[PDB]
């Protein structure tokens with residue numbers, strides 16, 4: 001079967017980190033911006049701390065441990081990594097802080113200042129991250145612009161492996177809440193998921209970036225999407241996109257999964273375009289646009 005998963009899961013002391021402000025709140029709990037100060041090491045690491053609220057719920061406790069399991073299992077510059085877990089009465093997951101939030105919100109907030117070089121670099125970075133996940137035989141199942149976070153405007157990372165599944169030595173889902181507008185056709189019909197179905201969602205994610213965060217198939221009921229797709233219709237060519245770029249998205253949306261690009265090929269193609277970005281995206285105005293703190297990426 002598969003190779004042994006020798007990832008390390010680090011257990012952290014609650015007294016080593018401090019919560020500074022709320023990044024986001026849900027029914028499940030809260031995510032804080034914070035600092036992690038390992039005892040004796042003389043480093044201050046910016047972190048996001050996800051803490052369950054009222055964790056007397058066995059389902060939420062099991063789900064956050066599965067998440068910790070997945071994140072520990074990965075190590076690439078284009079996917080978010082776990083620093084560790086803290087087993088307090090309310091369980092906590094400690095991750096690298098991504099100071100600029102999700103790329104979906106970043107692209108909406110800054111559209112008038114985002115040039116073609118940033119857009120095409122982001123496409124490369126997401127594809128390298130996805131290619132890494134495919135190497136590790138991990139299917140993300142939820143790639144979308146909301147699930148990419150921004151470390152710096154120059155460096156984004158895939159995150160939110162809420163639905164992510166490691167292939168046993170395709171993956172078949174049971175029925176549950178699932179993002180139909182981002183899904184390969186075979187995922188909507190037969191709840192099948194593969195690295196190739198991730199490519200489909202990658203295409204949709206690029207579409208979101210290239211439209212500066214427009215909602216795909218806006219207004220259309222998710223019940224209609226499978227037949228719309230079977231009819232051969234897809235998302236439209238974004239205004240800024242040359243046909244070279246749109247062609248790539250379209251290939252990601254072929255019905256024959258094996259006819260879609262590989263992530264390895266998407267890396268190459270978007271890197272080619274990143275060398276001459278204004279040849280490939282046409283954007284108005286494009287030309288013009290705590291002493292001991294250590295980023296988690298330099299903390300090994």
Ligand SMILES: CCC(=O)N[C@H]1CC[C@@H](N2C(=O)N(c3ccccc3Cl)Cc3cnc(Nc4ccc(N5CCN(C)CC5)c(C)c4)nc32)CC1
Pocket residue numbers: 023024025026029030031047048049050067093094095096097098099100101102105149159160161
């Ligand atoms: C409660 C549901 C919820 O709201 N989730 C969202 C908020 C938490 C967020 N998040 C995680 O879930 N992480 C994670 C993922 C999986 C497992 C464990 C963990 Cl820890 C790691 C993570 C790292 N960095 C950030 N940086 C960051 C986020 C938001 C914002 N702003 C604040 C001002 N707003 C107006 C706009 C948003 C900023 C400025 C920076 N957010 C993260 C994900 C999305």
